Design goal:
Chain F: This is V-type sodium ATPase subunit B. Chain F: It comes from Enterococcus hirae (strain ATCC 9790 / DSM 20160 / JCM 8729 / LMG 6399 / NBRC 3181 / NCIMB 6459 / NCDO 1258 / NCTC 12367 / WDCM 00089 / R). Chain F: Involved in ATP-driven sodium extrusion. Chain F: Belongs to the ATPase alpha/beta chains family. This is part of a larger assembly, with 1 copy of chain A (about 190 residues), 1 copy of chain B (about 90 residues), 3 copies of chain C and 1 copy of chain D (about 160 residues). With about 90 residues, chain B is of the alpha/beta class. Chain B has 5 helices and 4 strands; from the N terminus they run E-H-E-H-E-H-H-E-H. In chain B, strands 2-1-3-4 form a 4-stranded parallel beta sheet. Chain B starts with a strand and ends with a helix. With about 110 residues, chain C is mainly alpha-helical. Chain C is built from 4 helices and no strands. Chain D has a two-stranded antiparallel sheet. In chain D, a hairpin with a 2-residue loop joins strand 1 and strand 2. In chain D, helix 1 packs antiparallel against helix 3. The longest helix of chain D has about 70 residues. The chains are: A mainly alpha (about 190), B alpha/beta (about 90), C mainly alpha (about 110), D mainly alpha (about 160). Chains in contact: A-D, A-F, B-C, B-D, D-E, D-F. Chains A and F meet through helix 4 of A and loops of F.
């Protein structure tokens, strides 16, 4: 029944440090691979975090942690939407959900049967997540400068569609992903004006 | 016993002073006046839609009775939009 | 209920020379439009009909026809694969072509009624 | 945790919570109907008083500071469950506006107060519908299963001990 | 607790000759008003005293008195059937004629105080 | 999680000339405040942020978890530092609500 409380799963998780819990709800929703990002864990994340930061010379661990903070906050937000409705969340929280949305379907979701999407290099992964997080960072600053939520959304239709395609950018054209960062910064600042 | 306050441009809300209303005339200054009026236990606060358009988060907090009125130039349809919106979420149809 | 239903090996029995060249694309499109249609229907239940954008309203109407005319076929009624696929295109025509994002241009131009 | 006493108690809380859900949903509906009548009165009042006020203003715009220098003269009631205020107090143009302007305040406020109660009722309904009741349903199912499993395991062991 | 309690042979020891003619009818009536009054008490807790009608306030008071004066007789109190039936009528007297549906007007006019 | 946690030999190991005189009283008041604050948080997550006093307790429970319990696996606090920090959190509550602590300790700390 998918119930992980049974002895084989329990005994296994007693001696292994990684749990990729597959999820039936994700599989029905065509979210592949179907790994539950709230319940899954890797006890290697902190040591890997240090290795990644060091070999990349970027604050990758803090970006992974920020991305997960957003996903975790999304789960919190979703319970509130169920109770009051999405129109009752503040502009700040509306933004968080859109950024979370982007993480889910522009990053986590990956098509095993697509020539480009089937494998993502370590460098490509860093650029993708950086872009997704930059949008949220720049939009967040716009909100604190008096800009409203949908005004930001309505004027960033083209760049958000480009973020959502970045998973299909070939490995030798990675500059096309990193340059989205500048386009984000430009258009949002222009919207503030 | 409660007092009445009025917020808007001089040309529009001036004659209200004749009845002993607190008639006052940017997002920051309008928000300050409403807050003090609320703190002083005003019964009703009348305000032009052009001033109300600048302080939507302040008004939403108190929803004194904050009453949007027109100026001599007209409304922006805010008062009737607020009514329209509340109907949609309380009843489920127009 | 096609939402929780699945056939895992279906790719080996569909397409050109097995069924028809438009098989995989329309399946993906019908299924994805139906899921969105039913979602819009459930949204009308929880928040009212005034909660929906038009197109949400279009998708909702889509899911109705899909259930009543496509899935519902009768227990003594046999549809050829050609009849099934043709009927699929009729339902897809309700949607704006701009919304048929799961199907490439070459197939849309050839088959869409 | 999965005891038979918990099972019977949780089964009781489910019945209660289910009834409370129905009652609160009816209250929300009853509030909604009354709101519909008031909100339409609010709409008609606003449309009229907006036209009257702006017209009175346009007629006033068409020494004045000296004259405007030198007369300073809410009861609570229930609409079902809601606490609601009842309010009582070109120059002749503004003087005629006052009664209708105060009526606008009284009606518009009343609708705002009805709307708040509607939303607070709605949240309680949805908490029961999407959280409380399903949590009770899932727990009852769990206990019921676990009890069942252990009783089979118990009789299996007894038959083993029997043969010893 | 009379609601989950049951005697399956009760209709065989009651009525005229055996107890009194108004045995059966008052029993059905008391049972129904008791259940109704308990519902009313719960309604007051859920939705407030605001939601109770004038009839509902009575049923709530009925159930209160029913527990406290009818059921709660004491372990050393010996009530004759006559005294018991009479007490049932005094409690049912709280209700308007309109509410006492399970009792025919013939016997309602003979015993109702 | 301090609520289901326990020590059975804390009574005779604490107090004046062992830790500090305020030890037992503050421990009981903190436990009671945290249990009520944790209850109010759970209520606000289900019924919404908006009683006035329970809203104070909800903020207490938050500060308690984040600043008192959460200290880091390499942070070594003196008993004095721990007890003084406990008082900073009790200062969030109205004096009227501090019913586990007698007048002499309240006036002093």
């Amino acid at each position: 029944g998918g119930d992980i409380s049974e002895p084989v799963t329990q005994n296994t998780l007693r001696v292994v440090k990684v749990f990729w819990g597959l999820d039936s709800s994700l599989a029905q929703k065509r979210h592949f691979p179907s790994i539950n990002w709230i319940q899954s864990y890797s006890l290697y994340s902190t040591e890997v975090g240090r290795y990644m930061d060091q070999i990349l010379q970027q604050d990758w661990s803090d970006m992974v942690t920020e991305g997960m903070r957003i996903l975790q906050e999304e789960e919190q937000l979703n319970e509130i939407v169920r109770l009051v409705g999405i129109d009752s969340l503040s502009d700040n929280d509306r933004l968080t959900l859109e950024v979370a949305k982007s993480i889910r379907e522009d990053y986590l979701q990956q098509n095993a049967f697509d020539d480009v999407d089937t494998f993502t290099s370590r460098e490509k992964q860093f650029n993708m997540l950086k872009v997704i997080l930059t949008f949220g960072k720049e939009a967040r600053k716009a909100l604190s400068l008096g800009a409203y939520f949908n005004e930001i959304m309505e004027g960033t239709v083209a760049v958000r569609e480009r973020i959502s395609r970045s998973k299909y950018i070939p490995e030798e054209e990675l500059a096309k992903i990193s340059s989205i960062n500048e386009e984000i910064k430009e258009t949002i600042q222009l919207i503030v004006s | 016993t409660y007092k009445i306050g009025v917020v808007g441009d001089k040309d529009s809300v001036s004659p209200f002073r004749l009845f002993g209303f607190d008639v006052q005339h940017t997002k920051t200054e309008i928000r300050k006046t409403i807050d003090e009026m609320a703190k002083n236990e005003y019964g009703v606060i009348y305000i032009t839609e052009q001033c109300a358009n600048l302080v939507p988060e302040t008004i939403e907090r108190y929803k004194p009775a904050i009453i949007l009125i027109p100026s001599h130039q007209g409304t922006l349809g805010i008062g009737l939009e607020e009514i329209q919106n509340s109907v949609e979420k309380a009843v489920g149809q127009n | 209920d096609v939402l929780p239903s699945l056939s895992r090996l279906k790719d080996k029995g569909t397409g050109a020379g097995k069924t028809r060249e438009d098989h995989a694309a329309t399946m993906n499109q019908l299924f994805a439009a139906y899921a969105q249609g039913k979602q819009a229907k459930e949204l009308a239940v929880v928040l009212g009909e005034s909660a929906l954008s038009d197109i949400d309203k279009i998708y909702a109407k889509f899911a109705e026809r899909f259930e009543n005319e496509y899935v519902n076929q009768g227990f003594y009624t046999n549809r050829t694969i050609t009849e099934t696929l043709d009927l699929g295109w009729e339902l897809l025509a309700m949607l704006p072509r701009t919304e048929l994002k799961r199907i490439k241009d070459d197939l849309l131009d050839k088959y869409l009624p | 945790n999965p005891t038979r006493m918990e099972l019977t108690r949780l089964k009781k809380q489910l019945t209660t919570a289910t009834r409370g859900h129905k009652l609160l949903k009816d209250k929300q509906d009853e509030l909604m109907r009354q709101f519909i009548l008031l909100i339409r009165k609010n709409n008609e009042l606003r449309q009229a008083i907006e036209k009257e006020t702006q017209t009175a203003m346009k007629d006033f715009v068409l020494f004045i500071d000296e004259l405007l220098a030198l007369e300073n003269v809410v009861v609570e009631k229930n609409i079902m469950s809601v606490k609601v205020p009842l309010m009582n107090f070109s120059i002749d143009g503004f003087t005629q506006l006052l009664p209708k302007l105060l009526k606008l305040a009284e009606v518009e406020k009343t609708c705002q107060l009805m709307a708040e109660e509607i939303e607070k009722t709605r949240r309680r309904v949805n908490a029961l519908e999407y959280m409380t009741i399903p949590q009770l349903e899932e727990t009852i199912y769990y206990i019921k299963m676990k009890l069942e499993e252990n009783e089979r395991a118990e009789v299996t062991r007894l038959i083993k001990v029997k043969n010893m």
